Nucleic acid binder design. Structure first.
Ligand code: MG
Ligand code: MG
Length: 476
RNA sequence: AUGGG
RNA sequence: CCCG
C-alpha cells in the first residue's frame, strides 16, 4: 500500500525481542540454509547497512489507481465471480449472533481465547479473556460498546505490528526481510465474523475448484480430489505473486467488497462497511504510528478468504483485459490467499497477462524457478500448492501432498524450548508422504531421544483418511 | 494477528 | 504444529 503519514508519538508499542526458535539436534546434521528472521534492529547477522525498521516496511511501494474503465471491468469480474460463488454456496448469509460468532459454527472454528487482543487492550495488560467470555459466548462492556459503535458505523481502530518470529531462507534473514503481523482489535474480528461468518463457514465446507478456493481443505484428504481435477487440463500454471497482500489497491478492494457482499445476497448491510475499514489503516510500531492506503492487514478475521476472493477476481480481470470471450469456464483455479493454481485447455499467454495484473498493482512471475517466463504444457505433477507437490502414491494410486525434503529439514532443525516432542509428531504427518527412506533419514537425528512415529503407522492412518474403503479394501 | 488443518 |  501507500504510506501517507509516518507519525511519531512517545507512547511506545513493545514488540522487539529475541527469537523463540532454538536449533535442534537435527540442525548440526542437515545444516539448513534457513534461520530465525532477524527480530533486532541490530542482529549480528544483518548485512552491513540494513535497517530492519526500513526493509520491514519496504513493502508499501504504492497504491495503484485504476481508470474508470479498468474499474468498470473489475466490477463486472467481481460481479461475475460473485454470481458463481453464491450460486454454489447459496444465499443463506444472515449475520451470526454474538454467540455463534464466538463459538463458531459448522465449518468455522471457534474464536481463539488467549491470542493477542489488539488495541487499546494491549496497552493495559488486558487479554481477550478479560474482555470476552469464550465459555458461554458473551461479551464484556467495552466490547458491548465497540459493537454498538460498529452497528453505528462509527468505530475507529489501529493495527498493531508484530515481527513474525519464524524460520526463513538465510538470504532473506541476512537481508532483514522479516515479515510482520497486523493484530486487529479482538472486537473487530468478532464483528467481521458476525457480518461474514456464515458465508465463511460455507466457503470452508465447499472448498474446491468450483469456487476457486482451498481455504478449509485438508491436504491429506483433498490432494486426491485436487489432483484429479487439474490433471485433466492441457495447461496448468504455478503463478507466483510478489507481496500479494500489500499490493491490493483501494479500488480493487473497495469494488470487491461492494459486489460480493451485497444485501441482495443476504448479507447484513454493515458487511460491506466492516470490510472497507481494512482499506486505510493505522499501524502502531513501537512509538510510531503509520497511515496506509491499500493492502490488507494480516490478522483480520477473513484475510485468507478476502485474499482468495481477490485472487479469483484478478485472474478473471487479467484475462478479460487481454482476450475477448473469456468466461468463468475458459479456465479453472484454486487458491489459498496468494497461493494459486490455474489450468485451461486454452493456450493462455500468462506472460502477456503480466501487464494486466500490473494495472491492479500485482506482479506475477512463474513459480518455476526464476525461469524465462510462463510456458505452456505444464502438468499438475509439476506444480506446488501450499508448499506441497502433487505426487502419485505408488501404493494407493492416490495423489498425496509431498513437501520438499529441504523444507522438512529446515522445519525439523528449529523448535521452541519444550515443544520438540509434539513438533516431531506433527511434522511426521507431513513427512510420511516423502516415502519410507526419506522419512527415516529426516528423523534419525532424533532417534534414541524422542518418540518417532513409525512410517508404517502414519501410512495406514493416511490411507484410511484419504479413503476408508481403500483402507477397508486392502483387507478383502 | 488471521484463518485453515 | 503446519500451510496461505
Ligand atoms: Mg506468492
Ligand atoms: Mg505456488
Amino acid at each position: 500500500g501507500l504510506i501517507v503519514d509516518t507519525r511519531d508519538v512517545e507512547e511506545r508499542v513493545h514488540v522487539m525481542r529475541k527469537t523463540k526458535l532454538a536449533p535442534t539436534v537435527a540442525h548440526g546434521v542437515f545444516n539448513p540454509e534457513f534461520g530465525p528472521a532477524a527480530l533486532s534492529n541490530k542482529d549480528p547477522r544483518l548485512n552491513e547497512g540494513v535497517v530492519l525498521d526500513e526493509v520491514i516496511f519496504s513493502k508499501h511501494k504504492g497504491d495503484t489507481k485504476m481508470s474508470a474503465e479498468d474499474k468498470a471491468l473489475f466490477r463486472r469480474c467481481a460481479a461475475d465471480y460473485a454470481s458463481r460463488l453464491h450460486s454454489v454456496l447459496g444465499t443463506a448469509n444472515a449475520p451470526l449472533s454474538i454467540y455463534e460468532a464466538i463459538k463458531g459454527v459448522d465449518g468455522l472454528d471457534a474464536m481463539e481465547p488467549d491470542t493477542a487482543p489488539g488495541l487499546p487492550w494491549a496497552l493495559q495488560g488486558k487479554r481477550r479473556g478479560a474482555l470476552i467470555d469464550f465459555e458461554n459466548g458473551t461479551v464484556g462492556p467495552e466490547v458491548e460498546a465497540a459493537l454498538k459503535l460498529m452497528e453505528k458505523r462509527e468505530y475507529k481502530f489501529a493495527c498493531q505490528t508484530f515481527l513474525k518470529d519464524e524460520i526463513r531462507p538465510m538470504e532473506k534473514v541476512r537481508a532483514g526481510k522479516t515479515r510482520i503481523v497486523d493484530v486487529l482489535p479482538v472486537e473487530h474480528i468478532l464483528y467481521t465474523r458476525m457480518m461474514i461468518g456464515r458465508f465463511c463457514a460455507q466457503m470452508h465446507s465447499n472448498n474446491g475448484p468450483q469456487i476457486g478456493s482451498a481455504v478449509g481443505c485438508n491436504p491429506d484428504v483433498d490432494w486426491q480430489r485436487f489432483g484429479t481435477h487439474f490433471a485433466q487440463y492441457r495447461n496448468v500454471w504455478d503463478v507466483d505473486y510478489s507481496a500479494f497482500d500489500a499490493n491490493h489497491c483501494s479500488d480493487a478492494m473497495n469494488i470487491m467488497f461492494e459486489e460480493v457482499f451485497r444485501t441482495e445476497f443476504g448479507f447484513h448491510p454493515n458487511a460491506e462497511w466492516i470490510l472497507k475499514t481494512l482499506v486505510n489503516t493505522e499501524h502502531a510500531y513501537e512509538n510510531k504510528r503509520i497511515t496506509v492506503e491499500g493492502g490488507i492487514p494480516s490478522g483480520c478475521s477473513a484475510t485468507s478468504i478476502i485474499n482468495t476472493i481477490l485472487n479469483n477476481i484478478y485472474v478473471l480481470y487479467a484475462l478479460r483485459r487481454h482476450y475477448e470471450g473469456v468466461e468463468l469456464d475458459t479456465y479453472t483455479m484454486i487458491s489459498y490467499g496468494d497461493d494459486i493454481v490455474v489450468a485451461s485447455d486454452y493456450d493462455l499467454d500468462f506472460e502477456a497477462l503480466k501487464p494486466h495484473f500490473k494495472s491492479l498493482g500485482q506482479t506475477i512471475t512463474p513459480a518455476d524457478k526464476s525461469d524465462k517466463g510462463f510456458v505452456l504444457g505444464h502438468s499438475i505433477t509439476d506444480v506446488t500448492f501450499l508448499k506441497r507437490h502433487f505426487h502419485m502414491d505408488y501404493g494407493t494410486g492416490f495423489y498425496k501432498p509431498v513437501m520438499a525434503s529441504k523444507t522438512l529439514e529446515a522445519i525439523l532443525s528449529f523448535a521452541r524450548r519444550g515443544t520438540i516432542q509434539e513438533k516431531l509428531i506433527s511434522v511426521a504427518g507431513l513427512a510420511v508422504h516423502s516415502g519410507p527412506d526419506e522419512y527415516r533419514r529426516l528423523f534419525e537425528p532424533f532417534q534414541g531421544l524422542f518418540e518417532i512415529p513409525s512410517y508404517r503407522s502414519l501410512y495406514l492412518r493416511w490411507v484410511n483418511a484419504v479413503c476408508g474403503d481403500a483402507a477397508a479394501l486392502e483387507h478383502h
